[PDB]
Amino acid sequence: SETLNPSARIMTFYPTMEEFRNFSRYIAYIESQGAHRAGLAKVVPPKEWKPRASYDDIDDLVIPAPIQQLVTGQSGLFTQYNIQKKTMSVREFRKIANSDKYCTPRYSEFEELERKYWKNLTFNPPIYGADVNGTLYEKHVDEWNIGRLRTILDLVIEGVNTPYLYFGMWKTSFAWHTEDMDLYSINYLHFGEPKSWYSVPPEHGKRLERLAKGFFPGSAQSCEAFLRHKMTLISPLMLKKYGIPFDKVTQEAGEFMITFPYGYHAGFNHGFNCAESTNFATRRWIEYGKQAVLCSCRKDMVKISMDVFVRKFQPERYKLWKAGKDNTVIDHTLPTPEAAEFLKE
Ligand code: NI
Ligand SMILES: [Zn+2]
Structure with a gap:
């Protein structure tokens, strides 16, 4: 397993229609190939598959709580604050997003758009139409249906077992984080302009945390898991300066990204x-769930009870865990047990 994907580079996968039909089996397959070591993987669906016939009929869809992303900082280190804005429709959002004030700058190569992002992060705070409860999948679509993946997570939270829509514009950001309870996530880009990602391998996550704590000493003091506030922006230049391994990928319309525990x-x-997007689980997640370091400083943070998971999937350790003495050590290289059928027996 420490043999497979030794560089922890983001992998891209092109399932056949037949493989694409079985969601959890395909996740086990990509873990059999080492995809999880990167922390992020791209899955390009078969060209004939579409979750919806067209997106011409959603201009009246409501975005109840858009947020305006205020960013403060310099030299690759920034804090993002969310300002709640008034309810709006998709039509109204699109109008703003495509206006001269907020529209994508002219550029040639990706590297130029990336430079502009990091130069212009703190100016012209954009509006992000985030965390809208809903789905754009037609009700007949049974493949990779983010509204009903039917993983073991269903034994249990809005956006967490439920689908959320995110309407972006230029320069809207998602800060450094892992998922709630160190879950997996799935993200499908239904339409429009790309989304660019950075990742750090699970095996290096503790290294990122230590660097972040040193860069943001005040936030670290007041919360054990301050990165879960989703307010900390760190440029790739800053990671490179402190030897944190990372990768980048651009997700285009019609592509999925999977994020892995931690x-x-x-x-x-x-x-x-x-x-x-939504969260999901495999059997390997359960250990992550049990060990996830949670935000100490806010009420109403997402906290899942692991009890139901430990009783069902780990009966041999239940009494030990319930007493606080389960000291299992996670190996980030190991694929989920479901991957067995794709590995030498
Ligand atoms: Ni995420
Ligand atoms: Zn906190």
Whole structure:
């Protein structure tokens, strides 16, 4: 397993229609190939598959709580604050996103747009139409249906077992984080301009945390898991300066990204777009869930009770865990047990 994907580079996968039909089996397959070591993987669906016939009929969809992303900082180190804005429609959002004030700058190569993002992060705070309860999948679509993946997570939270829509514009950001309870996530870009991602391998996540704590000493003092506030922006130049391994990938319309337990990621939208996401689990997640370091400083943070998971999937350790003496050590290289059928017996 420490043999497979030794560089922990982001892998891209092109399932056949037949493989694509079985969601959890395909996740086990990509873990059999080492995809989880990166923390992020791209899955390009078969060209004939579409979750919806068209996106011409959603201009009246409501975005109840858009947020305006205020950013403060310099020299690759920033804090993002969310300002709640008034309810709006998709139509109204698209209008703003494509206006002269907020639209994507002219550029040639990706590297130029990336430079502009990091130069212009603190100016012209954009509006992100984030965390909208809903789905854009037609009700007949049974493949990779983010509204009903039917993983073991269903034994249990909005956006967490439920689908959320995210309407982006240029320069809207997602800060460095892992998922709630160190879950997996899935993200489909339904339409529009790209989304760019950065990732750090799970095996290096503790290294990122230590660097972050040193860069943001005040936030670290007041919370054990301050990165879960989703307010900390760190440029790739700053990671490179302190030897944190990372990778980058651009997700285009019609592509999925999978994030893996304890996979730190961040990134930004290129322009007007719409993405759908939720969390999911495999059997390997349960150990992550049990060991996830949670935000100590806010009430109403997502906290899942692991009890139901430990009783069912780990009966031999239940009494030991319930007493606080389960000291299992996670190996980030190991694929989930479901991957067995794709590995030498
Ligand atoms: Ni995420
Ligand atoms: Zn906190």
